[PDB]
Design a binder for this molecule. Structure first.
Ligand SMILES: [Zn+2]
Ligand SMILES: [Zn+2]
Lengths: 54, 1609, 38, 38, 38
C-alpha cells in the first residue's frame, strides 16, 4: 500500500504537469501569431519554437 | 529543338508577344516585324481570328473513311449478333460523316493536325508559310503569325495549339452528337449543336465578357434545369447569371433545349473546352492573387476563437470514432473543470449520445500521443513528376535574361547551371532525399532554413478564368513536408473522424448514394451543393493553429504541423511569368505586389489539402448540428454536397432555408465568405465525382468525355482508347462510345499514314479490326471491357471479329495474315505473361519501345550518387524478376492467373512497380535515352514501312474457323509450346445465340436462359428504374494460405515458398444496364454453370437494349440459347505441382465432418439474418443484402447438408436467444408474410419436396399442424420453437459445445469441405385418389376443402373414362385442379405456357411430391401455344373438355353424392356413371393428411393451435386477428364433427385478464378485445370425420376453454 | 522509516506547485485580455 | 518492477520539463526582439 | 542504491524548480511592463 499512496501523488504531479503543458501552449499560440503577423513584408528571420528532436 | 508540344498544356501567356512586339532586339524580331500587317491584332484576341478560317469544301478525300467505318461497325455488330441494329449504327455514321458542316469541321481538324505535326518537334527555327485555307500561318522560333487577310495576329505557339485543340474538340463534339442523337427517342439534335456553335462564334463582345459567358454556360444550364423541375425546394440559381442580359440568342437556345429535354440540355451544356481558352491577364491576375493571399475577412481574434471551437468538435469526432472502432477512449488527459459526464464516459469506455449536441464539453479534453509520425514516405509519393524548385538560388532560372535586362537595365546574375534538380524524381536520384528525418528536422524545430522558404506560383492551363488560377510549386523540403503531413493525416487521423470517415469507405459511399438516388425522386432528402471559390486562397493561420497544436501533440512531433500552419508568413512568393521578372536586389526577389510578395497569410493552393478538408467537415458539422437536422456531408474538394433528410415537422423549404442560413453564418466565422453565386439546393440535380445526376439517374457524359515521351501513333491511339474506355465506364452508352471511337480512330489514322495505305478500304478495315491482343495498334473495336465490368479474355473476341470480317466482307484471309504479321518470339518471355496473363508470346512491333525496363534500371543503378537507390538496386531487379517468372513457369498445369496472383505478392513485383513508376516521369526517360526528333521520324518510317510488305506472317487459316475457344487454346499452345490452360474464357456472343420466343422449337429449348419482361418495354424504360432488384502483404499471404489449405493443397514447395515470403516480412509461425435490368425478372433453369455468368446476364440485357433502340419493342420473353457446345468446357481444378524446386530465393531488402459444422453455421447465420431483418422497417427491406452475403450459394450445396441438423441448430439458437415480445411479434407478423433476405430465401431453397418429407422435424410434425400452402408449412416449421414447445424441446437434446465455437469468419470454408459429400435425395411420387370402372368406394377425395373439389374429381373421372395418355392444361384452369390432374399416373401433362414458366412454377410450389416435376413435360410445354388434341381450360374447340354446371343435381354418383357438373367432349357428353373409386394408397400432402380420419390427430392439431393462440394472446401489440381465423377454421371443423351448427359469424373476445389468456365468446371482462369472424362454412372434409362414436372422444380431456369454444350455447 | 521523511517533502512540493498554480491563472487572464484589447 | 518503471517515468518527466525550460527560454528572443522593433 | 539515486533525483528536481521560479520572476515583470507600454 505504501507504494500506491505516492503513486496517486505522482499522478497529480503528472496531471499538474499536463495542465502546465496546455497553459503555455496557449501562450505559444498567441506569441507565435503576434510575431508572424509582423513578419509579412519584412526580412524577419524564422526563430524556432521547439528545442530539438530527442 | 523548338516547338516541342503537340497539344495545349500551358497557360496562354501573352507577355512574350508584347515583349517581342515593342522591346527585344534579337534577329528573329527583324523577320517578325516584316510579316505583320497594318491591322495587327493583339494576342488576347486570337480567337477572333481563327473563327474566320474557312476551308474549300471537300478538300480531303475521306469517302474511304466513311465506307471503312460502315464496314467496321457492321462487322462488330454482326459479330455481337445484334444484327438488327446494324442499320441504325452505320446509317448514323454515314449521316455524321456526310453532313456539310460536320465534314467541314473534320477537314479543319485534319488540316490543323497536319500543320502541327509538320512543325512540332522540328529543329528548324523558322518554317515557311503554311496554308490553312485562307490563312497564312508562319512560325518563328516559338512565335506564330496569322495573316488571314490584311490583318495580323502575331501569337505564341501555345495560342495556335489552343486553336487546333478547339478545332479537334469541336470535331469530336459534332461526331459524338450526331451518333448519340441517332440512338434516342428524341434523336437528331445536331441542328441545335450547330446553332449553338454559330451563335457562340458570332459573339463580338469584349474578351472578358465573352469568356464570362462561356464559363457561365454550364452553371446557368444547371440553374435553368433546377428552376423548372424543382418540386419541393424553391431555387433562384438561374437568376444570378448574366447570359440573358449579354447574349439573348444563347439564352433562347438554351431554353429551347430545356423545353426539349433537360438531360439533353445538361449534356450539351457540359462541354466547356470546345470554345477557345482565354489569355490570362497576368498583370491583374497576379495582383489579385497576391492580394487575396493576404486579405483579412475576419479579425484574427475571432478566427482564433472559432478555431478553438473547431478543435473542440474535432476532438469530439475523433473520440467518437476511436470508441466506435476500439471500444475504449484514446489516451487523454482531462483538464480541470471536466464535466462529470465526460469522466464517466471515459471510465466506462463508452460514447454517450448527448455528446453529439454538446461538443463544447470537449474543450477540456486533450488527446495524448496515439502514434508516431512516419518520417519515411514510400516511393509511390516521392517518385512523381510534380515540378519543384531546388532552392532559393534557382529562382533566377524561371525568367528570361533578356527581358530582365530590358525591364530594369541590369543583367540577371544566373549561374551557368541550376544548383540542383528541377523535379522530385531527379532529387531522389541525386540522393538528396536519403535522410528525410534530417531534412524535416528544421520543421520539427519550426525554423525551416532560408534556402527552403520560396514558392513559385504557376498559372493553371485550360481554365476559363480571365484572371487565371495559380497552383503553387514548392521547394524540395516543403514538398517533402507536405507529403509527410498528408500521409500522416490520411492514414492515422482522417479514418478515425467518424462523420468524415463515412466519406471514403466506398461501401458507405455506395450505400449512401443509392439511398439518395432512391429517396430524392419522391422527395424527402434534398441536397445542398456547397462550392467554395476562395477556398484555396482562404484559411488563415489563426483558424487552424489549434488543430495544428492538437495534431502535434497526438503525433508527438513537436511543433511540426504548426510549422506549416504559420510557414507562409515567412515565405517569398513569385509569379512564374517569364518576360516579367521581379527585381533582384542581392540575389533575392524584391516585393512589388505584382510579380513578387514576401510573406502571405496562406500557403496557396495545393497545400494542406487534407487538413483543410478536416476543418471544412468540422465547421459544416457544427453549423448543421445546432439546427437539429440529419446530415450526410459528402465531398472532399472545394465543392461539397450536403444531404439533408426530411423532418417530420418541417417542410423541406423551411428546412433548406434554415440550413442555408446556418451554413452562411458558420462559414463567415471561418473567413470563407459564402455567396449565392455558388450555393443551390434542389431535389432534382446533385453532382458528385464530377458526374451530374438528374432525378437519380446519372446524366450521360458522352458529349463531354468524347470531346476531350516523344509523340508516336501508338501513344495517340492508346490515349484515345483509354479515354473512350473511361467514358464507357461512365454512364455513357457503349454504342455511342464505340461508334465515336471508331470514327476518331479512322480520323487519326488518316492524319498520319500516307495515302497509299489510307485509300485501301480493305487494308484500313483490317488494320482497324486488329487489336493489341494479337499484336496490333490499340483500337476501340477490340475492347470486350466496353460493355462488361470484370476481367475478360480479349483473344477469343479478337478471333471472332476477324472470323466475322472474313465471312461477311470481301477481305481475304491472306490480307488478314498480311496485316497481322504474327511473329512468335524465339524464346518464351515468362515475365510478360506473368504481368499480362491473357497476352500471347508475340513481338509487339508497334509497341513504341520494348526492353526499356532494363535500360531505365541500368541508368538508375549508375549515375546515381545516392544511398536509397543503391540499396534498392544492389543487383538488377529485372534479372531477378525474370528468374522468379521462370521459376513460376514450372506449374505443371500452367495457370497464368495464379502466376500473376503468386507474382503479385512478392517483393520483386514491388520493385518492378517502382521501376515502371520511374519510367512514368517524362524526361527521366530522356536521361536514360541519351535526339527524340529522329526517334519520332524513325518510328513513323518503321510503321509506314511495316504496312506495305505483302509477305505473310504465321498462317492463320487454322485459327479462324470453328469455335473461337478452341482457336484460342490452340493459339496459346502454339505460341508457348506447352499447353497453357485455365485462363481462356468463351465469347458470350458465340456462346449464346439470342432468339425470340415468338418462333422457337423444342430443340431450341433444351439449354437456354429465360428473360421475362414484366410489361412491354420501350424507350421510356431505358432511363427509368423499375421494381426488380506495407505489412498488409503479410495478411494477404495468410488469407491466401488459408484459402489454399482449405482447398486441401498441402505441398512442401508451396509451404516453403510462402514461409519464405512471410519471413521476408518477418512473420514466423452493372452500372449502365442495371436501370433496365430492374424491369426484367431473371431466372436460370439449366444447371450447367462465377464471374463469367455476369457477362452472360449483361449480354442478354444488351440484346434487350438493342432490340428496343432499333425501334422495336419486346413483349414476349426471349432466350439466350447455347450455340457452341465446344465452348462449354468441363472445368475440374487440379493441383499446382511446381515440379522443379523453387529457386527465386528472396529479396528482403525492399520495403469431425464439415456437414455438422456447416449445418450449425447455416442455422446460426440464418438466425442472425432474421434478427437483423426484424429490426429493419418497410423502407429498409428493399435491400436484399443479408447479414453477411447469405445469397452467393447454389442449391445442390445446401441440399447436401442434412436439413434436420440445420433446423435443430436454428431452433436451438432461437430458444437460446429468447427475445422479448416486440421481436417475437415482429418475427411472427413478418414470417407469416415474406419479405427480404428472410422466409423468401427459405422458400427459395425449399422447392424440392424431397427435403420436406425427408426433413426429420417435419415428418414428425406433419400430423401435428395444419397448413394451406407450402408457404405456410415452412413458416410453421421454422416458427415451431415459439408456437409448439411440445416437440421442439424434444429435438433440443442434440447439442455440442465445440460446434458453437465454430466461427463464421470461415463460413465458406465448411461449405467447400462439404461440396462433394454425396448425392441429394429423391422426389418420389405420391398418388392422389384415382377412379376406375370397377372399384371400391373408399370415400376419399382430393381437394376436399377446395370448392373445386367436385370439378377436379369430375375431370379426373372423365380423363380415366377416356383413357387419355396426353393432356393439355391452359393457365386459365384452376391451379389446384391442374395439380390434382397432374398427380394421375400414366398420364402426360403439357401445359400451354407460351414460353412463360410462371404457371408451371406455381404448380411446383404448391405440390409437395414429385408428380408435377415427373409428369409435366417442360420442353413441349414451353414450346406450345395452342393445344394439340385433348385440352382443358378452353370453353370450346376440338378435343376441349367442358364441364357444364347442372342447375339441379339429378344424379347421385356412387362416389360423388351430388353430381353438380356434366362433362362434354367436342359437344358430346361423357358418361361417367359406371366409374368408381380406385384403391387408395400412400397419398400426397394435397389430401391434407395432417387432419386424418383419426380424430386424435385432429385433436392434436386443435389443441396445439389452441395453445399457440393462448401464447399469442400474451404478446402485447400483436395483431392476433389473422391467427384467430385459422383457429376458427379448425373450430368449425370440430363443430361439424360434433354436429353443432356452423354459425356464419362468431364474435370472440380476446384479452389478458389477471395475467392469463382469455378467449371467450361472451364478454366477462371489459378489457377483452372484440373480434368478429365471418364467412364460416362447414368444411365437407369434416363430413368423413363426423362419426357418431367419434363425437364423445373429441371432448375427452380437452381444455375447458377449448370445450366451451367448440360447444355453441 | 526513511520513507516517512520523503513524504512530507512532496506535501510541501505540491503546495509549492499549488501556490505556483494560481500564479499562472492569475496571469492567465491578464495575458489573455491583452490579446482582445489590441 | 514498479519502482524501476516509475523511476523511468519521472526521468522522462524531467526531460519534458527541460524541454519546457528550452521552449520558454526560446521565446525570450522572440518577445525581446519584438520590443526592439518598437 | 535506488533510494540514494532517488534522493539525488528529488534534489535536482527541487533545484530545477528553483530555476523555474527565478526565470519566471525574470519573466513576470518584463511581460507586465508591456501593459504599461499600452
Ligand atoms: Zn464457340
Ligand atoms: Zn408433388
Amino acid at each position: 500500500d505504501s507504494i500506491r499512496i505516492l503513486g496517486e501523488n505522482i499522478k497529480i504531479l503528472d496531471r499538474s504537469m499536463k495542465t502546465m503543458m496546455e497553459t503555455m501552449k496557449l501562450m505559444m499560440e498567441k506569441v507565435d501569431l503576434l510575431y508572424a503577423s509582423t513578419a509579412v513584408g519584412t526580412s524577419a528571420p524564422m526563430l524556432p519554437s521547439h528545442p530539438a528532436p530527442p | 529543338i523548338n516547338r516541342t508540344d503537340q497539344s495545349l498544356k500551358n497557360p496562354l501567356l501573352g507577355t512574350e508577344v508584347s515583349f517581342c512586339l515593342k522591346s527585344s532586339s534579337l534577329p528573329h524580331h527583324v523577320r517578325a516585324l516584316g510579316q505583320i500587317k497594318a491591322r495587327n491584332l493583339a494576342s488576347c484576341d486570337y480567337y477572333l481570328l481563327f473563327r474566320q478560317v474557312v476551308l474549300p469544301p471537300e478538300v480531303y478525300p475521306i469517302g474511304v473513311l466513311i465506307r471503312a467505318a460502315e464496314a467496321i461497325l457492321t462487322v462488330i455488330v454482326s459479330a455481337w449478333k445484334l444484327d438488327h441494329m446494324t442499320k441504325t449504327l452505320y446509317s448514323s455514321v454515314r449521316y455524321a460523316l456526310t453532313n456539310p458542316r460536320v465534314r467541314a469541321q473534320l477537314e479543319l481538324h485534319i488540316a490543323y493536325q497536319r500543320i502541327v505535326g509538320q512543325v512540332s518537334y522540328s529543329r528548324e527555327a523558322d518554317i515557311g508559310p503554311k496554308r490553312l485555307g485562307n490563312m497564312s500561318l508562319q512560325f518563328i522560333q516559338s512565335l506564330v503569325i496569322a495573316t488571314i487577310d490584311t490583318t495580323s495576329c502575331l501569337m505564341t505557339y501555345n495560342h495556335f495549339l489552343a486553336a487546333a485543340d478547339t478545332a479537334k474538340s469541336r470535331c469530336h463534339l459534332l461526331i459524338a452528337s450526331v451518333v448519340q442523337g441517332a440512338l434516342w427517342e428524341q434523336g437528331s439534335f445536331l441542328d441545335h449543336i450547330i446553332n449553338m456553335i454559330d451563335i457562340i462564334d458570332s459573339i463580338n463582345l469584349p474578351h472578358d465578357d465573352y469568356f464570362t459567358i462561356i464559363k457561365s454556360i454550364f452553371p446557368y444550364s444547371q440553374g435553368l434545369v433546377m428552376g423548372r423541375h424543382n418540386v419541393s425546394v424553391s431555387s433562384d440559381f438561374a437568376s444570378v447569371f448574366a447570359i440573358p442580359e449579354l447574349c439573348p440568342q444563347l439564352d433562347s437556345l438554351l431554353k429551347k433545349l430545356l423545353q426539349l429535354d433537360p438531360v439533353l440540355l445538361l449534356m450539351v451544356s457540359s462541354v466547356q473546352k470546345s470554345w477557345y481558352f482565354p489569355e490570362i491577364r497576368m498583370v491583374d491576375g497576379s495582383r489579385e492573387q497576391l492580394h487575396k493571399m493576404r486579405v483579412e475577412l475576419e479579425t484574427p481574434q475571432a478566427l482564433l476563437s472559432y478555431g478553438h471551437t473547431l478543435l473542440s468538435i474535432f476532438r469530439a469526432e475523433f473520440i467518437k470514432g476511436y470508441v466506435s472502432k476500439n471500444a475504449k477512449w484514446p489516451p487523454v488527459h482531462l483538464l480541470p473543470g471536466c464535466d462529470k459526464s465526460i469522466k464517466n464516459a471515459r471510465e466506462l469506455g463508452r460514447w454517450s449520445p448527448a455528446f453529439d449536441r454538446r461538443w463544447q464539453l470537449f474543450e477540456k479534453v486533450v488527446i495524448l500521443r496515439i502514434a508516431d509520425l512516419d518520417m519515411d514516405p514510400d516511393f509511390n509519393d516521392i517518385v512523381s513528376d510534380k515540378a519543384i524548385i531546388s532552392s532559393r538560388r534557382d529562382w533566377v532560372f524561371e525568367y528570361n535574361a533578356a527581358a530582365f535586362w530590358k525591364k530594369y537595365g541590369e543583367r540577371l546574375e544566373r549561374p551557368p547551371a541550376r544548383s540542383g534538380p528541377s523535379r522530385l524524381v531527379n532529387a531522389l536520384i541525386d540522393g538528396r532525399l536519403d535522410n528525410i528525418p534530417a531534412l524535416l528536422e528544421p520543421f520539427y524545430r519550426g525554423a525551416v532554413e532560408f534556402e527552403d522558404r520560396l514558392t513559385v506560383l504557376v498559372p493553371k492551363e485550360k481554365e476559363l478564368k480571365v484572371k487565371g488560377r495559380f497552383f503553387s510549386k514548392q521547394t524540395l523540403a516543403i514538398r517533402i513536408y507536405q507529403v509527410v503531413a498528408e500521409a500522416a493525416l490520411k492514414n492515422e487521423v482522417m479514418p478515425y473522424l467518424k462523420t468524415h470517415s463515412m466519406t471514403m469507405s466506398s461501401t458507405a459511399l455506395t450505400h449512401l448514394l443509392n439511398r439518395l438516388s432512391h429517396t430524392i425522386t419522391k422527395g424527402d432528402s434534398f441536397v445542398i451543393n456547397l462550392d467554395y471559390s476562395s477556398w484555396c486562397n482562404g484559411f488563415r493561420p489563426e483558424l487552424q493553429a489549434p488543430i495544428c497544436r492538437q495534431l502535434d501533440q497526438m503525433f508527438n512531433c513537436g511543433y511540426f504541423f504548426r510549422t506549416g500552419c504559420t510557414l507562409p508568413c515567412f515565405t517569398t512568393f513569385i509569379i512564374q511569368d517569364r518576360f516579367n521578372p521581379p527585381y533582384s536586389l542581392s540575389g533575392e526577389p524584391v516585393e512589388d505586389g505584382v510579380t513578387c510578395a514576401v510573406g502571405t497569410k496562406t500557403m496557396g493552393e495545393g497545400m494542406r489539402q487534407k487538413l483543410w478538408t478536416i476543418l471544412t467537415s468540422c465547421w459544416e458539422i457544427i453549423a448543421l448540428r445546432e439546427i437539429n437536422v440529419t446530415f450526410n456531408i459528402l465531398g472532399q474538394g472545394d465543392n461539397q454536397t450536403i444531404i439533408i433528410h426530411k423532418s417530420a415537422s418541417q417542410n423541406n423549404q423551411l428546412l433548406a432555408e434554415r440550413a442555408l442560413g446556418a451554413l452562411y453564418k458558420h462559414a463567415r466565422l471561418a473567413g470563407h465568405n459564402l455567396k449565392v453565386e455558388e450555393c443551390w439546393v434542389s431535389d432534382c440535380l446533385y453532382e458528385y465525382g464530377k458526374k451530374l445526376f438528374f432525378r437519380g439517374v446519372p446524366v450521360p457524359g458522352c458529349l463531354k468525355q468524347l470531346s476531350r515521351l516523344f509523340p508516336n501513333l501508338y501513344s495517340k491511339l492508346a490515349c484515345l482508347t483509354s479515354s473512350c474506355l473511361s467514358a464507357a465506364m461512365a454512364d455513357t452508352s457503349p454504342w455511342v462510345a464505340l461508334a465515336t471511337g471508331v470514327c476518331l480512330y479512322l480520323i487519326e489514322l488518316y492524319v498520319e499514314l500516307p495515302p497509299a495505305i489510307i485509300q485501301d478500304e480493305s487494308l484500313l478495315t483490317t488494320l482497324c479490326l486488329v487489336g493489341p491482343s494479337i499484336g496490333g495498334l490499340p483500337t476501340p473495336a477490340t475492347l470486350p471491357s466496353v460493355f462488361f465490368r470484370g476481367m475478360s479474355d480479349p483473344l477469343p473476341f479478337q478471333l471472332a471479329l476477324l472470323q466475322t470480317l472474313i465471312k461477311t466482307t470481301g477481305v481475304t484471309c491472306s490480307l488478314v495474315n498480311r496485316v497481322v504479321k504474327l511473329r512468335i518470339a524465339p524464346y518464351p518471355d515468362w515475365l510478360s505473361l506473368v504481368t499480362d496473363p491473357t497476352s500471347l508470346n508475340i513481338a509487339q512491333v508497334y509497341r513504341p519501345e520494348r526492353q526499356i525496363r532494363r535500360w531505365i534500371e541500368e541508368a538508375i543503378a549508375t549515375s546515381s550518387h545516392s544511398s536509397r537507390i543503391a540499396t534498392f538496386f544492389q543487383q538488377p531487379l529485372t534479372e531477378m524478376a525474370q528468374l522468379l517468372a521462370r521459376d513460376l513457369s514450372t506449374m505443371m498445369p500452367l495457370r497464368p492467373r495464379d502466376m500473376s496472383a503468386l507474382f503479385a505478392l512478392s517483393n520483386v513485383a514491388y520493385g518492378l512497380s517502382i521501376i515502371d513508376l520511374f519510367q512514368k516521369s517524362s524526361t527521366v526517360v530522356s536521361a536514360s535515352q541519351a535526339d527524340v526528333a529522329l526517334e519520332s521520324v524513325r518510328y513513323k518510317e518503321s510503321i509506314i514501312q511495316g504496312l506495305l510488305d505483302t509477305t505473310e506472317g504465321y498462317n492463320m487459316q487454322p485459327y479462324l474457323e470453328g469455335c473461337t475457344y478452341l482457336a484460342a487454346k490452340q493459339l496459346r499452345r502454339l505460341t508457348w509450346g506447352r499447353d497453357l490452360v485455365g485462363v481462356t474464357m468463351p465469347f458470350v456472343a458465340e456462346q449464346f445465340h439470342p432468339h425470340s420466343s415468338v418462333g422457337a422449337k423444342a430443340e431450341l429449348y433444351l439449354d437456354a436462359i429465360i428473360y421475362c419482361p414484366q410489361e412491354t418495354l420501350r424507350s421510356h424504360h431505358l432511363t427509368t428504374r423499375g421494381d426488380q432488384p506495407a505489412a498488409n502483404l503479410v495478411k494477404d499471404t495468410l488469407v491466401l494460405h488459408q484459402w489454399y489449405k482449405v482447398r486441401k493443397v498441402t505441398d512442401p514447395h508451396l509451404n516453403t515458398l510462402m514461409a519464405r515470403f512471410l519471413l521476408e516480412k518477418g512473420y514466423t509461425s452493372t452500372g449502365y444496364v442495371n436501370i433496365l435490368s430492374t424491369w426484367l425478372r431473371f431466372s436460370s433453369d439449366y444447371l450447367h454453370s462465377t464471374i463469367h455468368f455476369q457477362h452472360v446476364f449483361t449480354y442478354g440485357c444488351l440484346y434487350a437494349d438493342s432490340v428496343i433502340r432499333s425501334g422495336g419493342v419486346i413483349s414476349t420473353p426471349y432466350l439466350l440459347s447455347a450455340s457452341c457446345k465446344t465452348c462449354f468446357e468441363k472445368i475440374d481444378s487440379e493441383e499446382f505441382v511446381l515440379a522443379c524446386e523453387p529457386q527465386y530465393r528472396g529479396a528482403e531488402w525492399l520495403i469431425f465432418d464439415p456437414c455438422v459444422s456447416a449445418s450449425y453455421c447455416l442455422g446460426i447465420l440464418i438466425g442472425k439474418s432474421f434478427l437483423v431483418d426484424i429490426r429493419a422497417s418497410g423502407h429498409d427491406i428493399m435491400e436484399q443484402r443479408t447479414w453477411a452475403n447469405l445469397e452467393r450459394f447454389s442449391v445442390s450445396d445446401m441440399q447436401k447438408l442434412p436439413w434436420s441438423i440445420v433446423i435443430r441448430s436454428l431452433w436451438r439458437f432461437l430458444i437460446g436467444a429468447r427475445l422479448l415480445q416486440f421481436e417475437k411479434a415482429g418475427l411472427i407478423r413478418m414470417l407469416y408474410a415474406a419479405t427480404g433476405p428472410t422466409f423468401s430465401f427459405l422458400m427459395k431453397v425449399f422447392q424440392d419436396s424431397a427435403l420436406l418429407m425427408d426433413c426429420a422435424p417435419l415428418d414428425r410434425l406433419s400430423p401435428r399442424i395444419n397448413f394451406h400452402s407450402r408457404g405456410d408449412l415452412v413458416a410453421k416449421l421454422v416458427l415451431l420453437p415459439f408456437i409448439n414447445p411440445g416437440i421442439v424441446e424434444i429435438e433440443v437434446s442434440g447439442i455440442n459445445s465445440k460446434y458453437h465455437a465454430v466461427s463464421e469468419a470461415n463460413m465458406d470454408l465448411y461449405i467447400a469441405a462439404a461440396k462433394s459429400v454425396g448425392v441429394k435425395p429423391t422426389q418420389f411420387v405420391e398418388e392422389t385418389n384415382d377412379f376406375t370402372a370397377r372399384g371400391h368406394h373408399h370415400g376419399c377425395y382430393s381437394l376436399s376443402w377446395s370448392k373445386s373439389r367436385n370439378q377436379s374429381q369430375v375431370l379426373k373421372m372423365v380423363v380415366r373414362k377416356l383413357k387419355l395418355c396426353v393432356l393439355y392444361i391452359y393457365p386459365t384452369v384452376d391451379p389446384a385442379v391442374a395439380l390434382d390432374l397432374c398427380h394421375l399416373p400414366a398420364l402426360t401433362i403439357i401445359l400451354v405456357l407460351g414460353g412463360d414458366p410462371a404457371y408451371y412454377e406455381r404448380l411446383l410450389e404448391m405440390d409437395l411430391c414429385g408428380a408435377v416435376s415427373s409428369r409435366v413435360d417442360i420442353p413441349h410445354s414451353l414450346a406450345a401455344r395452342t393445344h394439340r388434341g385433348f385440352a382443358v381450360g378452353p370453353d370450346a374447340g376440338p378435343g376441349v373438355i367442358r364441364l357444364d354446371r347442372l342447375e339441379s343435381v339429378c344424379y347421385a354418383h356412387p362416389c360423388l353424392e351430388e353430381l353438380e357438373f356434366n362433362a362434354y367432349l367436342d359437344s358430346e357428353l361423357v358418361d361417367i356413371s359406371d366409374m368408381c373409386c380406385l384403391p387408395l394408397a400412400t397419398p400426397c400432402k394435397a389430401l391434407f393428411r395432417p387432419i386424418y380420419r383419426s380424430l386424435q390427430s385432429f385433436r392434436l392439431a386443435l389443441m396445439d393451435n389452441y395453445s399457440f393462440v393462448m401464447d399469442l394472446i400474451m404478446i402485447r401489440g400483436l395483431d392476433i386477428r389473422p391467427h384467430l381465423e385459422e383457429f376458427d377454421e379448425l373450430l368449425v371443423v370440430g363443430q361439424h364433427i360434433l354436429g353443432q351448427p356452423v354459425l356464419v359469424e362468431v364474435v370472440y373476445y380476446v384479452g389478458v385478464v389477471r395475467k392469463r389468456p382469455v378467449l371467450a365468446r361472451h364478454p366477462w371482462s371489459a378489457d377483452l378485445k372484440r373480434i368478429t369472424v365471418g364467412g364460416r362454412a362447414p368444411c365437407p372434409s369434416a363430413a368423413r370425420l363426423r362419426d357418431e362414436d367419434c363425437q364423445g372422444s373429441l371432448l375427452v380431456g380437452l381444455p375447458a376453454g377449448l370445450t366451451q369454444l367448440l360447444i355453441i350455447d
